[PDB]
Design a protein around this ligand. Structure first.
Ligand SMILES: CCCCCCCCCCCCO[C@@H]1O[C@H](CO)[C@@H](O[C@H]2O[C@H](CO)[C@@H](O)[C@H](O)[C@H]2O)[C@H](O)[C@H]1O
Lengths: 1043, 50, 50
């Protein structure tokens, strides 16, 4: 400590070592927008083509929900049974669980269910995956010549690019947007009734002529003695061409003129599914969602991927151009550009404050070398714990710049003051001052981690977000107190200039600040004054109670955010038609929307990625979505050229002037967020009930919560209501008669109207599928039911209308389950004034008004809130108590910690103030901000109380005279820090452009906080000290001691 | 019964498509035999957890 | 804790049970571990007092 004063070089060496480890950690440290924050979820998905909601709910879904037992750390299970036959089961696991293990255990219990599945599902594929939605990037592929359709493009994407980019370093999951080429066989109902054939015969035909065969080998083992030739027998090779599919023989006519498949059906190379259609600025497109690899660098994955795409540019088909619809990367680089700008700026301001105050270049260089070192190291302690350069951790740095800077300033100052006062040569001056602040700095260390550490231990997703701040800040802190104890005292002692005793440089100079006098008189003004506010403390205690209560009111009338919504260079607009609607109507809406953007937002939009068949509303022709891109930030200057007003005006258009609801909006920060003032409800059927009864229970709870607009707002179901569905009743009897097989009936009806995945071929060197399905025009209207004939065993065709009734009814197209049982999901948020939890309780008191077999439960956001929200008081109680014990340690008091713990309010009231006036909100950044503020409040109060005591004890000064001296000698440094801080933070607060919402959240509270903090503390701390001190023993006294 | 080429473009190349974003992979090498055997080796950065 | 968790799921199922269906408790290694280790605590505190 003292030690390194006589070893500047041992210190330089430690400094150097920390700088080198930091910079090493700086070159090879990952960069991403946010760290892993959401609990781990694994998804099982299967597609049962042709099935309806109930078919998949009961054939695949429930069989899997039954075989999901004994998997470690299950939080909950949710599943969709979509009317496109796709079922999606999400198991969301307890926070921080091994993703890898959870997925493997899930997949190996699913694999125990696999035989219990239907063979279309078994062969279509059940898939188990990690449930991130956070795509690093969505890359679009097009063709300018317009030559190729989506299916063309998609196939190409799959066959040239998808793999070499997925070999690009930093790329984890690669996922394709669209369907690959399969052999599409479009049957004809006439040309089928003509040669008296059914789908079944087409099927078996295709299974027959199109396969590989278990052949054998010439000269094989075991051979015959003397054998001499050994070679592999080739047999039936699968068909490569459309051509050979035209040539497949369906039947022989009696006169022998034959029937090839070519005749009865249209045969083409066509997409594996035609549900979802993508337009890129109206131009045909397919896409690739690339995910950042696990632990990888986002920005270099981005540069490598773009370079690997461009390397392919000499091999691209004509006019086929790559495009970039969604890119996390540019926003991230620019976020980082601004954080770096900040750190170096806040630094630069500290140099200015320190010069235009200590007016000595070499004093000015010491913190100039101190914090660079504190930085580098913090990067290393973070590198060591496996953290990354993302939003939360860097704004953790920003948030910490104040304690780091302060720690340097306190020291350099105290030394210079020792010289200014006492006239010691520099080295002896530094031992004198270090000798004065050392123990306090250990104390400050202890009270600071005492507030910053409990916030590491929060639970859930919130707990994650906090742990980033907690750790970043405690490491910056710990390293800043070491740099304060090893390097700076050594830098102070070695490169600091001696001051002639009582110099103060008053007058002395002209061009560069008569200021000193101007500063000088003033500090006396200050002390003359302060003893007076100690002359009659009463008033000031009143005022204090006032400040506190105000702090509380200001605090309660504060809104509770989670994170700021940010213009991310991209947003999206989602489209919903009425139920039952067609691909064509929906597509109409998307086209309209796209043109609105490309027209009336000609200055803003760059590109519109319209996607039909896909909503986040659900799956269906009915739903559509348009992924919207904006021009880079330097070209969108204004206030209504930014996302707020863009989405505002777009939704403005599409609200009134439509037959369908189309809302356009900006995405949450953490792309899987909680809705702060809300909930995600699950109403559940527990006793064996039918969909009709639970739905009625949902309607009932819906109407009951609509009846409380004083507590709840927009409580809605998160599915699709029942639609009309069209039932075919096969009178088993009537067709039993007609000499038909029901297998043939069902499966011909099937392969006609849904289609059938039959067999596989080999296209251009790539195994791809073969589907057989009706052509378009024979399967649209219920009348087309007639065009289909089933051949009897005796030899005659039969119409469908000979053995079937047909009708309309309702049914549900989307069948939800919660933890194995049938459920209906209600999203919703709390009335503007009240808290989410209260609305949650009102919801429980409401859904308790539901029938037997109607139970409820909470999920996702409301799960994470109901388990981990009663924590906030326990942890800050540990903070209050731990901080109190640390200070009690530092001094020697059960009371003196009270003069310094009482300082906390003085800081908050400016922060609540600032939040309130800038109309911001009590969010994460505000809270870490709060702590930071309280943090310096305490640092300062601790140094002033320390000094007062030191004078009382180690000099026999009185109470008031010592508090006066103390406050005096610490006036200059309080001000030095606070000037720099306030000036370093200042830019954060005044910023518009990429992410400046954070910068705002961080800046505001801090600035106001610092203001009310210093400019209160320099008046209340003596009062805090003096009053508390007058509730201790006897004599001494008012004090003129000895020794 | 299948041939070398059959398994290289039917089974091998479909499996090597999915071996990306596997953590601490040094290189990948694969065999495609006419006895139908397909054989893929993923070789990892030293000290990776097996 | 697996026991507390099981008691929790059971407590979730109790309100939708048919008429008169009651859970009963024939066998549990659990209450013994709790009350046995608790006796070791009463001992500790008593020993303090002695
Ligand atoms: C960090 C940025 C700095 C900006 C802050 C600038 C200072 C703003 C607040 C100064 C407060 C001092 O207010 C001070 O009150 C005390 C007592 O209450 C007064 O003192 C006088 O008034 C009272 C009667 O009212 C007497 O009991 C007292 O003994 C007498 O000396 C001082 O005349 C006044 O200076």
């Amino acid at each position: 400590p003292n030690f390194f004063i006589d070893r500047p070089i041992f210190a330089w060496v430690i400094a150097i070592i920390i700088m080198l480890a930091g910079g090493l950690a700086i070159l090879k440290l990952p960069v991403a927008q946010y760290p892993t924050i959401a609990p781990p979820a694994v998804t099982i998905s299967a597609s049962y083509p042709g099935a309806d909601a109930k078919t998949v709910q009961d054939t695949v879904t429930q069989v899997i929900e039954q075989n999901m037992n004994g998997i470690d750390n299950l939080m909950y299970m949710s599943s969709n049974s979509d009317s496109t036959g796709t079922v999606q089961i999400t198991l969301t696991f307890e926070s921080g669980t091994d993703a890898d293990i959870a997925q493997v255990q899930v997949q190996n219990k699913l694999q125990l269910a696999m035989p219990l599945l239907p063979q279309e599902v078994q062969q279509q594929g059940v898939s188990v995956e990690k449930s991130s939605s956070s795509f690093l990037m969505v890359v679009g592929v097009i063709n300018t010549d317009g030559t190729m359709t989506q299916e063309d493009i998609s196939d190409y994407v799959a066959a040239n690019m998808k793999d070499a980019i997925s070999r690009t370093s930093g790329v984890g999951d690669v996922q394709l947007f669209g369907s690959q080429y399969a052999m599409r066989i479009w049957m004809n109902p006439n040309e089928l009734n003509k040669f008296q054939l059914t789908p079944v015969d087409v099927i078996t035909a295709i299974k027959a002529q199109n396969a590989q065969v278990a052949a054998g080998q010439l000269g094989g083992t075991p051979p015959v003695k003397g054998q001499q030739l050994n070679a592999s027998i080739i047999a039936q090779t699968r068909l490569t061409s459309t051509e050979e599919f035209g040539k497949i023989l369906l039947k022989v006519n009696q006169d022998g003129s034959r029937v090839l498949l070519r005749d009865v059906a249209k045969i083409e190379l066509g997409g594996e599914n035609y549900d979802i259609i993508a337009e890129f600025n109206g131009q045909p497109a397919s896409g690739l969602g690339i995910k950042l690899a696990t632990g990888a660098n986002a920005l270099d994955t981005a540069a490598a991927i773009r370079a690997e795409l461009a390397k392919m540019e000499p091999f691209f088909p004509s006019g086929l151009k790559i495009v970039y619809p969604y890119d996390t990367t540019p926003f991230v680089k620019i976020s980082i550009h601004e954080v770096v700008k900040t750190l170096v700026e806040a630094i630069i301001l500290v140099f200015l404050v320190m010069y235009l105050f200590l007016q000595n270049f070499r004093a000015t260089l010491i913190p100039t070398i101190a914090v660079p070192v504190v930085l580098l190291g913090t990067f290393a302690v973070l590198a060591a714990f496996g953290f990354s350069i993302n939003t939360l951790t860097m704004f953790g740095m920003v948030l910490a710049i104040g304690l780091l800077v302060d720690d340097a300033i306190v020291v350099v100052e105290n030394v210079e003051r020792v010289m200014a006062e006492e006239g010691l040569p520099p080295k002896e001056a530094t031992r004198k001052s270090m000798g004065q602040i050392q123990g306090a700095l250990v104390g400050i260390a202890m009270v600071l981690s005492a507030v910053f550490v409990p916030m590491a231990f929060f639970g859930g997703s919130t707990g994650a977000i906090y742990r980033q701040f907690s750790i970043t800040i405690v490491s910056a802190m710990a390293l800043s107190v070491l740099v304060a104890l090893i390097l700076t005292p050594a830098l102070c002692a070695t490169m600091l200039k001696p001051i002639a005793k009582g110099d103060h440089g008053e007058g002395k100079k002209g061009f560069f600040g008569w200021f000193n006098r101007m500063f000088e008189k003033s500090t006396h003004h200050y002390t003359d004054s302060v003893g007076g506010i100690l002359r009659s403390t009463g008033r000031y205690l009143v005022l204090y109670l006032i400040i506190v209560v105000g702090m509380a009111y200001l605090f309660v009338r504060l809104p509770s955010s989670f994170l700021p919504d940010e213009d991310q260079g991209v947003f999206m607009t989602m489209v919903q038609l009425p139920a039952g609607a067609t691909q064509e109507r929906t597509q109409k809406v998307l086209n309209e929307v796209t043109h609105y953007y490309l027209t009336k937002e000609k200055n803003n939009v760059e590109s519109v990625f319209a996607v039909n068949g896909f909503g986040f509303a659900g799956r269906g022709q009915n739903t559509g979505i348009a992924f919207v891109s904006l021009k880079d930030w330097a070209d969108r200057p204004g206030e209504e050229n930014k996302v707020e007003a863009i989405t505002m005006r777009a939704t403005r258009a599409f609200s009134q002037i439509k037959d369908a609801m189309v809302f356009a909006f900006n995405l949450p920060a953490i792309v899987e967020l909680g809705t702060a003032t809300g909930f995600d409800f699950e109403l559940i059927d527990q006793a064996g009930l039918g969909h009709e009864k639970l739905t009625q229970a949902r309607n009932q709870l819906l109407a009951e919560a609509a009846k409380h607009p004083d507590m709840l707002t927009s409580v809605r179901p998160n599915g699709l209501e029942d639609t009309p569905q069209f039932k075919i009743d096969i009178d088993q009897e009537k067709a039993q008669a007609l000499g038909v097989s029901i297998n043939d009936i069902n499966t011909t009806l099937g392969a006609a109207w849904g289609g059938s995945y039959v067999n596989d071929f080999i296209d251009r060197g790539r195994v791809k599928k073969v589907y057989v399905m009706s052509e378009a025009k024979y399967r649209m209207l219920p009348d087309d039911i007639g065009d289909w004939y089933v051949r009897a065993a005796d030899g005659q065709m039969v119409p469908f209308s000979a053995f079937s009734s047909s009708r309309w009814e309702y049914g549900s197209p989307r069948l939800e389950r919660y933890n194995g049982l049938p459920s209906m999901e209600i999203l919703g948020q709390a009335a503007p004034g009240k808290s989410t939890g209260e609305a949650m309780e009102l919801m429980e008191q409401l859904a308790s008004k539901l029938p037997t077999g109607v139970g409820y439960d909470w999920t996702g956001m409301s799960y994470q809130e109901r388990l981990s929200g009663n924590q906030a008081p326990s942890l800050y109680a540990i903070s209050l108590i731990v901080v109190f014990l640390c200070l009690a340690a530092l001094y020697e008091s059960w009371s003196i910690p009270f003069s310094v713990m009482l300082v906390v309010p003085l800081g908050v009231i400016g922060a609540l103030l600032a939040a309130t006036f800038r109309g911001l909100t009590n969010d994460v950044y505000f809270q870490v901000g709060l702590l930071t503020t309280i943090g310096l409040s305490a640092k300062n109060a601790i140094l002033i109380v320390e000094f007062a005591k030191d004078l009382m004890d180690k000099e026999g000064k009185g109470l008031i005279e010592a508090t006066l001296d103390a406050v005096r000698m610490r006036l200059r440094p309080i001000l030095m820090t606070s000037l720099a801080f306030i000036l370093g933070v200042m830019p954060l607060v005044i910023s518009t452009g990429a992410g400046s919402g954070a910068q705002n959240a961080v800046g505001t509270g801090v600035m106001g906080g610092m203001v009310t903090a210093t400019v209160l503390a320099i008046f209340f701390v003596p009062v805090f000290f003096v009053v508390v001190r007058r509730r201790f023993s006897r004599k001494n006294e008012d004090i003129e001691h000895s020794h």
